[PDB]
Amino acid sequence: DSPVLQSAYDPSGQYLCYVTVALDKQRVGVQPTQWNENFLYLEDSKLKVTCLKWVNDTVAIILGMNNGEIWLYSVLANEVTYKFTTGNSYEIKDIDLMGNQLWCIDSSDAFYQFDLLQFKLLQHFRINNCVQLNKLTIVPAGDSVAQLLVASHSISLIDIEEKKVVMTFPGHVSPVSTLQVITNEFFISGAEGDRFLNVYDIHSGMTKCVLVAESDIKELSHSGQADSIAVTTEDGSLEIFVDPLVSGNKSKKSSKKIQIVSKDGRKVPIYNAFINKDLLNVSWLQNATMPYFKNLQWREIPNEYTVEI
Amino acid sequence: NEFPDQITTAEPAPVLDIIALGTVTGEVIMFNMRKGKRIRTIKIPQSRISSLSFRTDGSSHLSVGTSSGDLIFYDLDRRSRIHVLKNIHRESYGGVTQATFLNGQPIIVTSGGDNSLKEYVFDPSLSQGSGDVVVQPPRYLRSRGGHSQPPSYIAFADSQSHFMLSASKDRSLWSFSLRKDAQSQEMSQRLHKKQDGGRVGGSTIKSKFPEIVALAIENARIGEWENIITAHKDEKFARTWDMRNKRVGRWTFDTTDDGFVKSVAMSQ
Amino acid sequence: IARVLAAKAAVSLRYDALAEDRDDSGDIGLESRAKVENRLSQLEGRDLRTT
Amino acid sequence: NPKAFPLADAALTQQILDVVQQAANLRQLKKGANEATKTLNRGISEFIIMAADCEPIEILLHLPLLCEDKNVPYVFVPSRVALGRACGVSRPVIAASITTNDASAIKTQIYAVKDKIETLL
Amino acid sequence: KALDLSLKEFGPYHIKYAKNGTHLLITGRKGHVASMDWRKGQLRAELFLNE
Amino acid sequence: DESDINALTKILSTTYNYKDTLSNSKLLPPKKLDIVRLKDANASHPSHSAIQSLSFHPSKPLLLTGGYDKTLRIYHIDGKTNHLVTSLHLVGSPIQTCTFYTSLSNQNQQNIFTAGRRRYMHSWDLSLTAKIEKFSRLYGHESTQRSFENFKVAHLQNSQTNSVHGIVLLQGNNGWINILHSTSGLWLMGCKIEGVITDFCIDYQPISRGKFRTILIAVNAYGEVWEFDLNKNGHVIRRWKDQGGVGITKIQVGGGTTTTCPALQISKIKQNRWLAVGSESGFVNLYDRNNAMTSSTPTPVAALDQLTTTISNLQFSPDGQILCMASRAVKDALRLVHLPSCSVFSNWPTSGTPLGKVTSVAFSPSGGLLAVGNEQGKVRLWKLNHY
Amino acid sequence: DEEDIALEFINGEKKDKLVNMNSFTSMFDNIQNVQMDTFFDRVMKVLT
Amino acid sequence: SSLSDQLAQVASNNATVALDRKRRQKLHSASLIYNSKTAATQDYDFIFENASKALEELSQIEPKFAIFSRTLFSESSISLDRNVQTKEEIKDLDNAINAYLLLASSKWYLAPTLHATEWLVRRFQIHVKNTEMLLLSTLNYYQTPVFKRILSIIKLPPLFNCLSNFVRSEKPPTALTMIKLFNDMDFLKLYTSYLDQCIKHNATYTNQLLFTTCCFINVVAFNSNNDEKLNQLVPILLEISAKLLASKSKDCQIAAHTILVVFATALPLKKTIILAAMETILSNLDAKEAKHSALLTICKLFQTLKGQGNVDQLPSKIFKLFDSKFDTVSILTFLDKEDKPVCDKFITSYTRSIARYDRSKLNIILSLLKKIRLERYEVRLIITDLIYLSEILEDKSQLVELFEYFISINEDLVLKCLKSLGLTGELFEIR
Lengths: 309, 268, 51, 121, 51, 387, 48, 431
Hints:
This is part of a larger assembly, with eight protein chains of eight kinds. Chain A has strands at residues 4-9, 15-21, 26-32, 49-55, 60-65, 69-74, 80-85, 94-98, 101-105, 111-115, 120-125, 135-137, 148-151, 154-158, 165-170, 176-181, 186-191, 196-201, 207-212, 217-222, 228-233, 237-242, 251-252, 256-261, 267-268, 280-285, 291-296, 304-308. Chain A is an all-beta fold. By secondary structure, chain D is α+β, with helices and mostly antiparallel strands. Chain D has helices at 10-26, 33-41, 63-69, 80-87, 107-118; strands at 29-31, 45-51, 74-77, 95-99. A four-stranded mixed beta sheet of chain D has the order 1-4-2-3, with helices on both faces. In chain D, helix 3 (63-69) links the parallel strand 2 and strand 3 (74-77). Chain D is globular.
């Protein structure tokens, strides 16, 4: 099992920002993905982070913590720049930005808007029929701050100016874990504990395809045009679906399977890969905490691949 | 007049035209509609008052149900606290939502949002002469209860279609009835002692089990030995229970291969 | 109490039989009396009838 | 402590407290002042060690008189809590007699200690 | 003295005081027969039956 | 009845919790510990002998483990899991005691000092195969080291220039304790007491800003101890007798800084308050050192006798609040005492805890982790909720 | 420096004297016919 | 439900009536002086006339009994029956017996009081029906043949049910079973209602206050390591510590002081209830022993504070009250006594508040800081407030006197405090 609690790749695959535990603190860190180690701890065990996301004009991380704050934290400088807050001490479960517009859900069902250029709160609101929340995503249609997608155990496409639910998809039997928009209309979703990804149209509510993998998933990464989606599975393998929006008619099996076996016969796990156009950034824990990488050529390797180290 | 904070709950008192109001902060204010005034106020600070009720058996008690999970009985003939009651319903699902007396009767009925419903009887007083100043704490009584989260697995215990087993998602196993709901009871996770003469396995502190994925059930030799078995979330073994004694059986079975258990079944 | 008072009688007795500088005021005498007395009280204060 | 006649030195105190530790290991001693005088009267004691740390010293120095009558060796040690922790009892004892068993496993160190005690009178 | 010996698990009761006003004898239609003092709490013969 | 010296009655009617339960205490609540288990620290990689020594890195999250199976592992430890980082294996030689060492000046040395029952100790350097050195040369005094079976590691500022360097300190055979040089390996001096050296511990005390003199305290096997400073040459500056105590077996000082929690800045040194000498009859005397300064025959502030058999390992909390007694003889033989009020913690070490035949115990420097290594070849890891 | 301030705060804390089961069963012998101030400083003697 | 239960109800409801000669002799041989074979032949006028002599002796030693010789010990009271009248009259006679018993609870070392109260034991049947006022009015004399006689005569009410193995047994019950009787809180509420009725009638005396104090400190000692039971047991002992402090006698005053100090050392209370208990024990200080006892409880009760605020400023509305009831003088003499009880945290909060709220008598803070020993974070905190004081007002000579004292001892601490705030050159330029 992983001692990396949670990790996030930067866009265009250069730096992995990962938070692990180190004697009831939270060793956060940034690692280049071609030696960066002097990165911070927070104070005590009751201040652990809950979500994190990149922002690419400087480059920085946002850490949605559990005490009730968001921490805008630089990377070149080591200190935290700003501490966004709500008025409540409730646990932020997910954060997502779009340009300047930031949006964080709570654990007490609220929604908060923010902006990382004005550094203040905008709207502080809840809605009915969303009784838990653990994912949200602002949709890409340019500067479309409207029509965001919240997700917990069923997915609710909700407006920001009509301010109510406009469509409701069936989710899973578990709380959702991965929800990401891959086109201007399609979004992939998948809970934890189950091996089933389902992609949804945003305008019809019809489950177009179901992707399957040989295990339950941990994190997905799609390309820039939704033609390759690589998930990392809980048994430490990498499953890449090539061209997942064509027509083996309703439920696509996994195409590429990369797992990493060292030259003594010991399987090492893979967490949080990243696939842009024709590369693959496989990451794995060599020692107990310090991760290593590999830039694998993606489209030319065979259907299965035991990477030796 | 304009009240300083949001009066979130109310109930009409059995004395003539006074109404009890509970604020968002901890103040019970007793408004008097005839005089247009307030009569008294009592404070339960840094706590959210969620329900009010009044005892109507001749004696005068008040019952605040505060949404931190707590339930207090005030006595208005002495402005005192008879007894508190800590964590009837859990705070996360809302705490005590509605907790009423019954008209003339010294029993209260409490229900939260975590699928519990209990009733609590006041004893008659223990000192024969003084009486109404030594009031016993309220005893537990009949209760009904679900398990606050949607169930993960469903089984039917007997061939009679009488009792079902629900494996929940709050890491709890319950036996529910189908005829009339008097016997909905949790199977207690007090592990039996290992038969070697030595102490038990597992946690000494009563934390509940892992999440319960898949179970299996038959009625072939009930009561003579362990009846049902189950398999938990990412747990290296699969453990049994007993349908008759309604608790965990002795022997867990390891899978002896260092893997998670996913599919249990039993011979008929 | 006969055993504990015999033991304290042995203490006091051999002290004031073997010392050659005492002031004959009975100091460890009434000290041992106080110790025997609260020993007696804290052993009679038990009640072997289950209350 | 002027009436405390012979009390041992540092090294002799250490070696007799290690031999009384081994005596308590092998269960070959009787501890306490009244038990010491009992075993002295019935005449089994190899030697007597006594602690010159109690608020009367006359609680123990009555057994020197019959100890001199019966020619047994006897020696003082400056710490009764040391006697307790070396004899294996959670209370501070005063005196300890070592009983006689020629079929022991510590006979030779007991006898060497006995000579080192009877040499200083 | 103004008693109420309210019993519900046996049927519609029936009274007979003694010749002097001391003892009481009650009878349920289900099976209950109780002969008892009533100014003193001295239940001296209770008997259930099944007829 | 109404239409509306009474102070505490009115506020009894106001509130209904009656302890300052929160983080506004900064002290351990006596006679009631608050402690949770964690995952087994030896789960990702099994051991094979008795865990003879545990330690922590004084800044990094590394728990170092070594035993009689002639290997030494170093885990990276946290709550849900813990993994192995490296695991060096020395053939031929067991390791009776092995410990971290970071230099005080540069904080970029990270040596491991591992010694067994043989004559050599091994020095590992850590900067991320890997090399080691074999300290095996007593210079002038070879007939005074039967073995390197017990050692300690301590800093020293050299008192005419501030060249702070480390020192290992060895148990002798007659009455000796040699010190050495941690980096080079020169002899520096050897002090000596009479009887048998049984154990010893290292005090520090500051003198001015950025300047400190260390003190080696060493016990007899009888109970009179010698404390001599060694920032000058090692001659005795005080010698005092334990009030009682005969067969004493371990001594540990601390409360300030010591081997289980050193500093990294030089001026973060601190004079150790509590001292704890523990016998073989189960008894533990503990003194303060603000009334036992020049008394030359001080009184025990506490005389615990709570555990029965012969004690081996007694450690402190890194801020000096919780002593840990641990006797390596019988099963389930560890206790924790609340040190300022010298009470004994009642609720935790109960029979529903799988301590086993405890043979090493070690505190974390800042997380409040508590590692206990037993004889069966594992180490369990509790966490104290207060720290 | 703040860690040194907090560690000095928790070092500067003297030995309290607790209460336990039979801490005051000795009062029931000299309970009878004693002035209240003598009982009070006797209790303060048992505490301190 | 159970007919046997519904009949035992009327049995205990009509125990105080005689319906044959055997029950009459069983209800009449219960007497407080004589045994059965003599008390079973006593006509009522005999015990009435010797009890009238007993009441006259008690009246000429105590002047509040002529009202009873008028009313309840009258000549017609030998023909007044108990259970033939109406319930309003039985309630009036009930609290008449209650008034008599808690008036004559302090006289039970006297044969006149025994022979006086024997009459209404024999006639008004208070050995059966007004039972608990008798029991917990004469509970304090538990090592006495009069209490063994009371306990053999009476039947036990269900609260006192752990005395029931001392009926017909010639050993008097023990201190440990008295504490086991005081342990369960549903006896404790009843005893506290008795105690505050006795307070408001103002009959509190130095034997039953002693007994109540020793029972409360042993109950607290029994629950010393039971956090839940102590948390449930605070608002009984504390609430009647309050309405015992609201009285006037020095005995009950320092008895409340004793239960307060033992409860504060039993568990660490909250800072606000320590402050309010200090205001309560300080707003009603009258006598001489009350001063010394209140000072000792303030010092110890304020010392037991392990957490921040423990050396903070005590507020003004209680600080000027402390300055009123206690002078700054004789605080010096309590400090100058030899045994020196531990008072460091209260002395520190006293110094911080005399620095921040009076700022005109600093020779006093110099003197008491010179004559007490002090701990290091406390002296750092008071010199931090002293630097705040020295930069809010002008540097007078007594201010620089105690500052040069704080220079002459602990140079490193005052320099570290000034390194936290500025520079010693600017400080010396100020002074």
